[PDB]
């Protein structure tokens, strides 16, 4: 037989120095790294498409 | 002796549809017309000058 070696799943850091393999799970529980006060979004498109 | 008329003071609109001749008083009581979630301020200068 021929050996296959497994690499440990990398961890991505989130807010408060917390680590988690999953991005969605870690982000939903610990939050993002920096504080964005708000997203002032600009919208361009059809008036029907704005709805 | 010559005539001298007076014009009514102009009013400026604030939040909640409220009007006030002054701006400092108008903001101090009613606030601005639109809401900015936050101001992300970037600073360029010396280390001493950032203090």
């Amino acid at each position: 037989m021929k050996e296959l070696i497994y690499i440990e799943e990398p961890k991505i850091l989130f807010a408060h120095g917390q680590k988690c393999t999953d991005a969605r799970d870690g982000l939903a529980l610990f939050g993002p790294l920096n504080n964005l006060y708000g997203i002032k979004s600009g919208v361009i498109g059809t008036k029907q498409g704005l709805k």
Side-chain angles (χ1 to χ4, degrees), chain A:
Chain A
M1 295 298 102
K2 305 175 187 294
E3 181 180 359
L4 267 72
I5 190 166
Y6 154 80
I7 298 85
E8 304 87 2
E9 189 67 30
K11 305 233 164 195
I12 49 185
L13 190 76
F14 294 90
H16 282 117
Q18 300 299 323
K19 301 179 182 178
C20 182
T21 62
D22 186 74
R24 302 180 302 296
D25 279 335
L27 184 62
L29 294 174
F30 305 103
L33 298 170
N34 59 355
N35 211 339
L36 285 189
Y37 296 111
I39 292 168
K40 283 260 152 202
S41 54
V43 180
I44 190 167
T46 311
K47 166 175 53 182
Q48 184 271 347
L50 174 59
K51 180 181 182 293

